[PDB]
Amino acid sequence: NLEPIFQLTFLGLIVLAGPAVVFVLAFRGGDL
Amino acid sequence: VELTESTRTIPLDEAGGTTTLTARQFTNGQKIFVDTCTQCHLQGKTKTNNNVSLGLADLAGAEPRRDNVLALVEFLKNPKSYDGEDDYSELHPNISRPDIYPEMRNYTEDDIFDVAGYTLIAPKLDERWGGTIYF
Amino acid sequence: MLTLKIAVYIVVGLFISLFIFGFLSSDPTRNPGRKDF
Amino acid sequence: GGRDLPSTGFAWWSGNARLINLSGKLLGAHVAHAGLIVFWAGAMTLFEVAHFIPEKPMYEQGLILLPHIATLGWGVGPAGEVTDIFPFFVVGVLHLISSAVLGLGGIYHALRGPEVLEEYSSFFGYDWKDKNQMTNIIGYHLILLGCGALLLVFKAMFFGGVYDTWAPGGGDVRVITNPTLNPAIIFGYLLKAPFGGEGWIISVNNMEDIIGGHIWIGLICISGGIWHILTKPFGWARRALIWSGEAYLSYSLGALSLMGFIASVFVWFNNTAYPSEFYGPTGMEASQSQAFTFLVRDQRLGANIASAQGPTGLGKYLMRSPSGEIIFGGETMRFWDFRGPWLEPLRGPNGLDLDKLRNDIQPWQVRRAAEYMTHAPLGSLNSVGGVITDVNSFNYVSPRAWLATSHFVLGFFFLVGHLWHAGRARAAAAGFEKGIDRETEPTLFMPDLD
Amino acid sequence: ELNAVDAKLTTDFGQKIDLNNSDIRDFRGLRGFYPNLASEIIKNAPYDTVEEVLDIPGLSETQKSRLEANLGSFTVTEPSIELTSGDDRINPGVY
Amino acid sequence: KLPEAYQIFDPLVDVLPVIPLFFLALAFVWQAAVGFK
Amino acid sequence: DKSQLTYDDIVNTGLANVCPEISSFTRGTIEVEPNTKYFVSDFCMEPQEYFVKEEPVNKRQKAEYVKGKVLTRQTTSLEQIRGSIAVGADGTLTFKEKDGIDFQPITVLLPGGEEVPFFFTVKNFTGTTEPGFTSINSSTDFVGDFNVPSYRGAGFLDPKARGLYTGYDNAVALPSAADKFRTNKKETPLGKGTLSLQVTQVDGSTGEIAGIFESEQPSDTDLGAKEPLDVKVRGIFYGRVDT
Amino acid sequence: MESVAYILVLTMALAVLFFAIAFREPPRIE
Amino acid sequence: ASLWEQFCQWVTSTNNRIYVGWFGTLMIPTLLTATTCFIIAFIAAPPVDIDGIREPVAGSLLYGNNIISGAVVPSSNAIGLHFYPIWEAASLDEWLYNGGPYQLVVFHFLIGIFCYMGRQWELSYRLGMRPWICVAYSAPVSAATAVFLIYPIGQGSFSDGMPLGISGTFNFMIVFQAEHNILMHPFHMLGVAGVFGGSLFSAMHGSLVTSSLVRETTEVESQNYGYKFGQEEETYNIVAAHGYFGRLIFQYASFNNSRSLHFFLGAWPVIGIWFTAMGVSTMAFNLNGFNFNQSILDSQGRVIGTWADVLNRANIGFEVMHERNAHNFPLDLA
Ligand code: CLA
Ligand code: CLA
Ligand code: CLA
Ligand code: CLA
Ligand code: CLA
Ligand SMILES: CCCCCCCCCCCCCCCC(=O)OC[C@H](COP(=O)(O)OC[C@@H](O)CO)OC(=O)CCCCCCCCCCCCCCC
Ligand SMILES: CC1=C(/C=C/C(C)=C/C=C/C(C)=C/C=C/C=C(C)/C=C/C=C(C)/C=C/C2=C(C)CCCC2(C)C)C(C)(C)CCC1
Ligand SMILES: CC1=C(/C=C/C(C)=C/C=C/C(C)=C/C=C/C=C(C)/C=C/C=C(C)/C=C/C2=C(C)CCCC2(C)C)C(C)(C)CCC1
Ligand SMILES: CCCCCCCCCCCCO[C@@H]1O[C@H](CO)[C@@H](O[C@H]2O[C@H](CO)[C@@H](O)[C@H](O)[C@H]2O)[C@H](O)[C@H]1O
Ligand SMILES: CCCCCCCCCCCCO[C@@H]1O[C@H](CO)[C@@H](O[C@H]2O[C@H](CO)[C@@H](O)[C@H](O)[C@H]2O)[C@H](O)[C@H]1O
Ligand code: OEX
Ligand SMILES: [Ca+2]
Ligand SMILES: [Ca+2]
Ligand SMILES: [Cl-]
Ligand SMILES: [Cl-]
Ligand SMILES: [Fe+2]
């Protein structure tokens, strides 16, 4: 079913969002 | 073994006519059983009155006998006492009374057929179906 | 029974009072380190 | 502010202690966290709305937030039937959006705002040792807490009412018109014993007493707020308490632990503020429901339910409480203090009345008793309903069970946190939280014990 | 030495339904009996012979035909209080 | 169920409540990004 | 009086174990016709004093009753009992208990530490007066007999799981000595008791009657393990006669 | 009379507790 | 100089052989009360109708018990959660029949142990110590409160409290497994990890220290005489111990820090006992252990049993046999 595909995609986007913020702040040397 | 055709072959009425549920109908009846019936009819017992259980001897002993699909469908539309004398439409969940039984109000005729079919198939998968409360 | 109840109520009230007024009696100052507070 | 061990003396695993004297970053921590609480409120409400089957009882469906909203009188009708799904959705959306606002504000103050607020404003900047400012903040927040209790009062009296399970005609949303302002009843609830038959404040059994208590709480909290804005701590309070940020934290921890225990017991026993139409039956309710169900069933078969002795010699269906009240038999003798709207019509002055049990039992009481005895708060951790010896076909654990277990555990761990922060506050104010000084070790100057 | 219900199990109580001692659950094997006609049998007990189960007041014609149809499944022994005191005929503690 | 015009976002709502848990995880990640100092 | 009181007024106060009292000291009477049945509505029975006939080692010493203290609490009253008072041709009044809460298990403590449980009951009490009564008054003494069922039912299990219609019939913990105990064979015989209800107060305006009772009945045999002791119970009673 | 033996062993344990506390070997720094 | 200040100085005195303190003013009376009543009831109390079914259970030594079978039996099921002090009984014999000594002993004991925890803080404060020994003692306190108070509150009867006896404790455990499947409850599993691991770490730590003691004696005298009480030097070689244990498994599995190691020793069984106390406290509200009965089905739908199903058969046996005259109705709901 396509419901669980979207659930996993929304979950994967939310999961990557936090480490993305950390990764852009570490890659550009922000106020970590 | 597999869930064969003969395991899903159950009596339809009292005249010897039989019916054979599909796998989809068996799974829909099992789902309706888990969602609606099991709070009192877990493993074929009756937690509120275990003199009248879902075991095959008890279903055969009802008046008229309820070990076929049509009698079970008639019971879930108009439930009676075990001798078929007292009106139990305000005491047993049924599709004819949505105002007091809203959980059954969206179940179609084929949904009642499937849950009746599952009620007939489940005793031959379990030797403890319809026994005592602790068993 | 009533005499026992009154005696037990008095005994419990006296011990609880001691605890409350004991911990109200500058108990932060009763320590071997600093006691200004 | 130091963000490492060499500059703070606190490790990473104790990092938030680096904020104790950084009031701006502390405020941002506090405000982002509130974001989180309002976020869970909104997102959990939207989840519960999305999974809700409204013709099915809420307690069958793993819901702990929609019962709270339904008890306030939103989206429900008689017998707690769901009229409209939109108030629950509205409560969810408003919390979720606001939580976005609160999260943005906490991030600001935490990452960009000034790390200390004392050089910026005297009203907002605080020193933990400044007893006037600490009581000012207590006072502002007390006026707000009293306003919240008065908002519950306003919802019950002026803006649509609350769900009363005890309402005549059946339980319904009703507007409270005569709240109990009598302080004898309101504070005699505080004076009642925390034991069987008395139940302290868990035994509040009517909405008039609840709404009147919140009028008094609102009045008490508003008056105590002004008190603490206008006043300073007195000498006995100054000499009795520890005055530090960790100390005030630990005082709040002990308070939170107490309210967590009270909440777990409240949801386990009380069916008025936690109506059984939304939360399911209490355990006492379900046991009395089983005894009533089999009283009715055997009476229909012609048993003399009053003259029937059981195997022990006590009455099988009816027996006497230790003070003499006519109560249900078997193990539910323990639960003879239970009161419920389905049961109280069959009760007389002496207890359960024989005439009402013979010729006043209605079919809805039988239906409710069967439903409540089969929805007893017994269940496995993987949500298998009923007794633990039952097989896997009934997916049910009561919301009362989930809420009570959660809050008991939370309450216990917050008592542990109280002990940890109180003890540490005492040691840090006394100066030996980092260990015994070797030169001035106090035991080396004490005399020997024997 | 046997207790009294064991000695009753030696009799015809241990083979078929006794209108004076059998619990209501034993009437479920006859079609149309549980719960109403069995309750009327238990309430109007005792009986000296099987035949006076037909002389219960308030029996309908269908109930009389059902009782006549299942007359051979019934026995009558002496009423034993060990099975009848405290309404064990209605609820003997068996579920 | 959600109201009908919101029902296209039923899966996203289904993953909404566990976002605070990730926040507890996220701090550890940030400490891992700075060396757990 | 607990007539205007509610449940919340009576609960946990012990007033649910006491029989209603005829407030009116009216020494009235209730007129009765010579072949009519009058129903008794809420017959209550409050035991107050408890005695057990002691069993001495001597055979010909006087037996005598010794007072016992109740260990069970305020759970010792019969109430909500329906009955019938029929008047025969010769004015003989007959009290006949029908149903209600007509039994309480009561455990009393004797001097010496012997605990005597007994099945205090008025079950199927039939009690006659002297002939020649035209009313119910202060001279009405219903003297008669009632049934005493066994204290333990036949579904009771002893601490070694032996009972009458359930449980073992032998001492299973001692496999070579299992059938050598007479306590393996349980029995529940039907005992008999004597009850005198002496009416002392008749309120003819509402048909209320009150008075005293003296009762004698056997005690618990523990499924026939021991011989029953004789228990004498004295107390007070109330009822409402339906004219 | 087995109760006498039980009371004796429990009393011996409690008396050992009393003597082990009130008349312990006192700890001394030397 | 005042009489009250002199009493405050005596109560809080570090020179007392047994420290009293303000928590001790509550602990000493309560614990002495519960100890006296427990000893008297364990020796001589008459049988208690625990289940409220007029079937009194003999618990004391004088009524035929031994030390193993003896107990102070819980209060009557008829009492439930009702407060039953001595003065609410019509006689002492009624109070004894209904299990009043259990309520007296339990309530005083529980106050006494909470004040024991507070007294541990109090003496740590008066000695200039760090204050968290009482946090460690909160784990046995939480377990005692779980079995004596919290489980009766959740089940609605002190009759469901753990009896004050050895075989009564076993009865409590067995009935608890029958009704809650505590073995399949992940928090008991943490308790067991707590006590098994705590004993493991007790043995490892003791063995590693005893293995690495500095030679200070002869082999005639006991090695314990190589330690002087109050000596400044360390009595064992932590580097040898670490060099042993980091070769027994590998180097970074071994503590080189004594403070880190001692923290771990304190923390592991305390956390485990906290978890199992919360398991019993949550099973009070019948949030039971894992139910995997008929979790596995063959393609037809026939049950394939597992070890959980055999465990469930054992749980049934206990359940249908326990309090065998108490139940009148098909479900054990509390
Ligand atoms: C409720 C959870 C919570 C909150 C609100 C805080 C808040 C704070 N911590 Mg603590 N912390 C927590 C949990 C929390 N912490 C936990 C669980 C640990 C253990 C791992 C720590 C360990 C810790 C240490 C060791 C330190 C702090 C410090 C701080 C402060 C400065 C943070 C900083 O410099 O980050 C900088 C980090 C970043 C810039 C990375 C990005 C962080 C942002 C917030 C991500 C937000 C993502 C979010 C989805 C975006 C939404 C935006 C909008 C739509 C709303 C800040 C007030 C520091 C301190 O004391 O300051 C003096 C410090 O040294 N914390
Ligand atoms: C007060 C807190 C609380 C309570 C009572 C509930 C209760 C419930 N939730 Mg909700 N939930 C909560 C918080 C809560 N939740 C939070 C914070 C989140 C976000 C992560 C969610 C997200 C959520 C979702 C997404 C769903 C639920 C669902 C449910 C239901 C089934 C729960 C279940 O199967 O659990 C299983 C039991 C466990 C997982 C056990 C967890 C044990 C914890 C970790 C122990 C912690 C102990 C202690 C605090 C640790 C401290 C350690 C240290 C101090 C030493 C139930 C009604 C489900 C439902 O039916 O909804 C319709 C569902 O789908 N909840
Ligand atoms: C408890 C929460 C709290 C507290 C105490 C503060 C305190 C402060 N903030 Mg912060 N802030 C918060 C939340 C908070 N803020 C949130 C949630 C946001 C995001 C919207 C911000 C965003 C923010 C910014 C961007 C700035 C501040 C600034 C300031 C400082 C100056 C305040 C000022 O000018 O007030 C005087 C202002 C008023 C009296 C008007 C506002 C009145 C409020 C907003 C209306 C009603 C409140 C609310 C809507 C009621 C419902 C709330 C609900 C949760 C119950 C002060 C230290 C400034 C700063 O850092 O100074 C250096 C600054 O630049 N704040
Ligand atoms: C949550 C809000 C809050 C907080 C944090 C405080 C905090 C404080 N208050 Mg304030 N107060 C509040 C609300 C609050 N109050 C309200 C709403 C009112 C109005 C009624 C007042 C009225 C008030 C007055 C009149 C006074 C204070 C004072 C104080 C200070 C000392 C209190 C103290 O030592 O208590 C410790 C408590 C005691 C020493 C009393 C011992 C009695 C025993 C221990 C009670 C045990 C009860 C038990 C634990 C729980 C049972 C629950 C229930 C049945 C009772 C402290 C700063 C005092 C002060 O310095 O004034 C400026 C003071 O005189 N408060
Ligand atoms: C609102 C309540 C509150 C507040 C504001 C604080 C605030 C603080 N605490 Mg305290 N604490 C509390 C409650 C609170 N605590 C409770 C209830 C307990 C008992 C368990 C403790 C026990 C405690 C100890 C033992 C210590 C502190 C310390 C501290 C300081 C540093 C904390 C830090 O950086 O954490 C960093 C955060 C982490 C390392 C992460 C914690 C991980 C937990 C175990 C997760 C629990 C699981 C959770 C339920 C979700 C499950 C997720 C799962 C699915 C994976 C800070 C001042 C420290 C201190 O004394 O500083 C002076 C310290 O050593 N706290
Ligand atoms: C030498 C005598 C040995 C007795 C052994 C008895 C069986 C014990 C089996 C368990 C093994 C576990 C030991 C691990 C511990 C271990 O490794 O032991 C070693 C230890 C000697 O070791 P060390 O020389 O290093 O001494 C350590 C000292 O520094 C002490 O701290 O032996 C003992 O302590 C005494 C022997 C145990 C004695 C225990 C008491 C037994 C007496 C009980 C009899 C009462 C019955 C009453 C009826 C009369
Ligand atoms: C500081 C810090 C921290 C913290 C942070 C925090 C705590 C935060 C937060 C935050 C928050 C608190 C947030 C938020 C948010 C929200 C949002 C973003 C929202 C929204 C919305 C929406 C978009 C919605 C939508 C919808 C609707 C409208 C309805 C329908 C459904 C849906 C869902 C679609 C940490 C730990 C990291 C550490 C470092 C530092
Ligand atoms: C709303 C409501 C209500 C009402 C309620 C009320 C009215 C209340 C209250 C409340 C209150 C009124 C409270 C309180 C409290 C208190 C506390 C909780 C305390 C305490 C304590 C402390 C904390 C102390 C401490 C100490 C000591 C002991 C001594 C030394 C010093 C110190 C400080 C340490 C009712 C129920 C009607 C109904 C329902 C709703
Ligand atoms: C030092 C700190 C404070 C301690 C001082 C307190 C002293 C004692 C106060 C209360 C003790 C006596 O309090 C009194 O107890 C009896 C119990 O027998 C209660 O009496 C209650 O039960 C008895 C049964 O015995 C009934 O007869 C009575 O009708 C009923 O009201 C009273 O209602 C109560 O007022
Ligand atoms: C300082 C107190 C510390 C505890 C010490 C007290 C116990 C020491 C022994 C003295 C006890 C004597 O007290 C007496 O004991 C006997 C034996 O159980 C009890 O007798 C009890 O048991 C026997 C048989 O088990 C029964 O026949 C008797 O009917 C029953 O009451 C008495 O009721 C009690 O009064
Ligand atoms: O008491 Mn003690 O064990 Ca709790 O579960 Mn119901 O109660 Mn009775 O049974 Mn099973
Ligand atoms: Ca349902
Ligand atoms: Ca979905
Ligand atoms: Cl048992
Ligand atoms: Cl029961
Ligand atoms: Fe060590």
* Nearby residues of B1 by Cβ (< 8 Å), 6 or more positions away: I298, I299, I300
CA distance I54 to D2: 70
Residue E95 lies in a domain: no
* Nearby residues of D345 by Cβ (< 8 Å), 6 or more positions away: D356, D360, D365
Q: Structure tokens of D210?
A: 């609840």
From D358, B92, B60, D300, select the one nearest E36 (Cα to Cα): D300
Beta bridge partners of G240: G208
* Nearby residues of I74 by Cβ (< 8 Å), 6 or more positions away: I48, I50, I99, I102, I158, I159, I160, I161, I163
CA distance I80 to D172: 32
CA distance I89 to I81: 15
Chain A interface mutation, best of F7, F12, F21, F24, highest count of A Cβ atoms under 10 Å: F12
Instruction: State whether residue H25 sits within 8 Å of chain I by CB.
Output: no
* Nearby residues of I300 by Cβ (< 8 Å), 6 or more positions away: B1, B2, B3, B4, B7, B125
Residue E48 lies in a domain: yes
The 3-class secondary structure across I245-279, one letter per residue, is HHHHCCHHHCCCCHHHHHHHHHHHHHHHHHHHHHH
Tell me chain H's radius of gyration from C-alpha atoms.
Answer: 14
Cis peptide before G189 (omega within 30 of 0): no
Residues G217, G220, G224, G228, Cα dihedral to 10° = -50
Instruction: State whether residue D234 sits within 8 Å of chain C by CB.
Output: no
Contacts of H24 in chain D (CB under 8 A): 450
Beta bridge partners of G202: G27, G209
Q: Structure tokens of D41?
A: 């409120």
Cβ contact B45:B130 at 8 Å = yes
In short, whether C20's Cβ falls inside 6 Å of ligand 9 is no
Backbone φ and ψ of D400, nearest 5° = -65, -40
CA distance B103 to D81: 12
In short, whether I332's Cβ falls inside 6 Å of ligand 11 is yes
Q: Using the beta-carbon criterion (under 8 Å), do G164 and E4 form an inter-chain contact?
A: yes
Q: Using the beta-carbon criterion (under 8 Å), do I229 and H28 form an inter-chain contact?
A: yes
DSSP secondary structure string for all residues of E13-55: GGTSEETTT--GGGGGGSTTTTTHHHHHHHHT---SSGGGGTT
Domain span at E47: 1-85
**Helix (H) or strand (E) segment spanning residue D352:** strand D351-352
Q: Structure tokens of G181?
A: 């105990």
**Facing I326 at nearest CB: one of D331, D337, D447:** D331
* Nearby residues of I36 by Cβ (< 8 Å), 6 or more positions away: none
Burial class from Cβ neighbours inside 10 Å (0-12, 13-18, 19+) for residue G56 reads: exposed
CA distance I232 to D15: 34
CA distance G140 to G211: 10
Cβ contact G117:I54 at 8 Å = yes
Report the domain count for chain E.
1
DSSP secondary structure string for all residues of I187-254: HHHHHHHHHHHHHHHHHHHHHHHHHTB---S-SSS-GGGGPPTT-SS-SB-HHHHHHHHHHHS-GGGS
CA distance G67 to G233: 10
C-alpha distances in Å from residue D281, one per residue of D152, D268, D372, I318:
24, 9, 6, 27
**Secondary structure of residue I79 in the 3-state scheme:** coil
Cβ contact D325:G18 at 8 Å = no
From G169, G159, G126, G133, select the one nearest G36 (Cα to Cα): G133
Burial class from Cβ neighbours inside 10 Å (0-12, 13-18, 19+) for residue G234 reads: middle
CA D52 from centre of chain = 23
**Which residue owns the Cα nearest ligand 5 atom 58?**
D14
Q: Known binder of ligand: residue B41?
A: yes
Distance between Cα F7 and ligand 10 center (Å):
76
Backbone φ and ψ of A14, nearest 5° = -65, -40
Burial class from Cβ neighbours inside 10 Å (0-12, 13-18, 19+) for residue H17 reads: exposed
**Helix (H) or strand (E) segment spanning residue G79:** strand G78-87
From D212, D201, D205, select the one nearest D157 (Cα to Cα): D212
Q: Known binder of ligand: residue I137?
A: yes
**Facing G123 at nearest CB: one of D307, D319, D325:** D307
From I67, I79, I80, select the one nearest I39 (Cα to Cα): I67
Backbone φ and ψ of G119, nearest 5° = -95, 85
Residues D25, D30, D32, D35, Cα dihedral to 10° = -160
From D149, D30, D43, D28, select the one nearest D95 (Cα to Cα): D43
Q: Structure tokens of G91?
A: 């004015």
Residues I142, I143, I144, I150, Cα dihedral to 10° = 80
CA distance D111 to D32: 11
CA distance D73 to B124: 48
Q: Which residues of D are annotated as a binding site for [CaMn4O5] cluster?
A: 331, 334
Tokens 């009405």, residue? G140
Burial E32-62 (b: 16+ CB within 10 A, else e): bbbbbbbbbbbebbebeebeebeebeebeee
Within 13 Å and on the Cβ side, how many CA atoms surround G208? 17
Q: Using the beta-carbon criterion (under 8 Å), do D40 and F20 form an inter-chain contact?
A: yes
Q: Structure tokens of H25?
A: 């070997």
Residue from D138, D192, D203, D217 to probe ligand 8 pocket by mutation (most atoms less than 8 Å from CB): D217
Cβ contact I135:D419 at 8 Å = yes
CA distance G12 to I308: 46
From E83, E5, E77, E23, select the one nearest E46 (Cα to Cα): E77
Cα angle at G111 between G110 and G112, to 5 degrees?
Answer: 105
How many beta carbons lie within 10 A of that of residue D439, not counting itself?
6
How many beta carbons lie within 10 A of that of residue B127, not counting itself?
11
CA distance E14 to D445: 89
Q: Structure tokens of I145?
A: 């409160």
Cis peptide before E46 (omega within 30 of 0): yes
**Helix (H) or strand (E) segment spanning residue D163:** strand D162-164
Residue E73 lies in a domain: yes
In short, whether D424's Cβ falls inside 6 Å of ligand 5 is yes
CA C5 from centre of chain = 21
Sign of dihedral through CA atoms D162, D167, D169, D174? negative
Counting ligands in written order, the one closest to the CA of D389 is: 11
* Residues ending a continuous segment of chain C before a break (C–N > 2.5 Å): none
**Helix (H) or strand (E) segment spanning residue B20:** strand B18-20
**CA-F27 nearest atom, ligand 7:** 38
Chain I interface mutation, best of C5, C18, C27, C30, highest count of I Cβ atoms under 10 Å: C30
From D225, D209, D210, D217, select the one nearest D150 (Cα to Cα): D217
User: In this structure, what DSSP letter does residue G91 have?
Assistant: S
Beta bridge partners of G70: G108
Residues A11, A17, A18, A24, Cα dihedral to 10° = 160
DSSP secondary structure string for all residues of D69-88: HHHTTSSB-GGG-B--SHHH
From I59, I95, I93, select the one nearest G112 (Cα to Cα): I93
Q: Known binder of ligand: residue I49?
A: no
Backbone φ and ψ of G208, nearest 5° = -75, 145
In short, whether C11's Cβ falls inside 6 Å of ligand 9 is no
User: In this structure, what DSSP letter does residue B37 have?
Assistant: I
Q: Known binder of ligand: residue I185?
A: no
Backbone φ and ψ of A23, nearest 5° = -70, -40
Q: Structure tokens of D205?
A: 């059994």
From D276, D376, D368, D293, select the one nearest D330 (Cα to Cα): D293
Question: What residues in chain D have their Cβ under 8 A from chain B's Cβ atoms?
Answer: 55-57, 81, 293, 297, 363-364, 366-367, 370, 373-375, 385-386, 389-391, 393-396
CA distance D326 to D306: 10
**Helix (H) or strand (E) segment spanning residue E75:** strand E74-75
**Which residue owns the Cα nearest ligand 2 atom 24?**
F17
Pairing, β G37-53 against β G65-67: antiparallel
Backbone φ and ψ of G182, nearest 5° = -70, -15
Q: Using the beta-carbon criterion (under 8 Å), do F16 and D3 form an inter-chain contact?
A: no
Q: Using the beta-carbon criterion (under 8 Å), do I78 and D379 form an inter-chain contact?
A: no
The interaxial angle of helices I186-211 and I238-248, nearest 10 deg, is 130
CA distance D286 to D271: 12
Cβ contact G84:D334 at 8 Å = no
CA distance B31 to B23: 12
Nearest residue on chain D to F20, alpha-carbon basis: D36
CA distance E91 to E93: 5
* Nearby residues of F35 by Cβ (< 8 Å), 6 or more positions away: none
Distance between Cα F18 and ligand 2 center (Å):
10
Cβ contact B112:B76 at 8 Å = yes
From G17, I111, E87, B78, select the one nearest D297 (Cα to Cα): E87
Cβ contact G197:G16 at 8 Å = no
Beta bridge partners of I72: I164
Tokens 């005729």, residue? B109
Burial C7-28 (b: 16+ CB within 10 A, else e): eeeeeeeeeeeebeebbebebb
CA distance D200 to D262: 10
Nearest residue on chain H to D449, alpha-carbon basis: H26
Q: Using the beta-carbon criterion (under 8 Å), do I328 and E93 form an inter-chain contact?
A: yes
- The amino acid that residue D202 corresponds to is I
Nearest residue on chain D to I312, alpha-carbon basis: D389
The 3-class secondary structure across I118-148, one letter per residue, is HHHHHHHHHCCCCCCHHHHHHHHHHHHHHHH
Nearest residue on chain I to B126, alpha-carbon basis: I302
**Secondary structure of residue I9 in the 3-state scheme:** helix
Burial I48-60 (b: 16+ CB within 10 A, else e): bbbbbbbbbbbbb
Q: Provide the resolution (angstroms).
A: 2.0
Cβ contact D321:D336 at 8 Å = yes
From D224, D233, D240, D327, select the one nearest D284 (Cα to Cα): D327
Nearest residue on chain G to E94, alpha-carbon basis: G155
Cβ contact D311:D388 at 8 Å = no
Cβ contact I184:I308 at 8 Å = yes
**Which residue owns the Cα nearest ligand 9 atom 24?**
I88
Largest CA distance in chain H: 51
CA distance I68 to I158: 22
CA distance D281 to D371: 9
From G132, G148, G139, select the one nearest G231 (Cα to Cα): G148
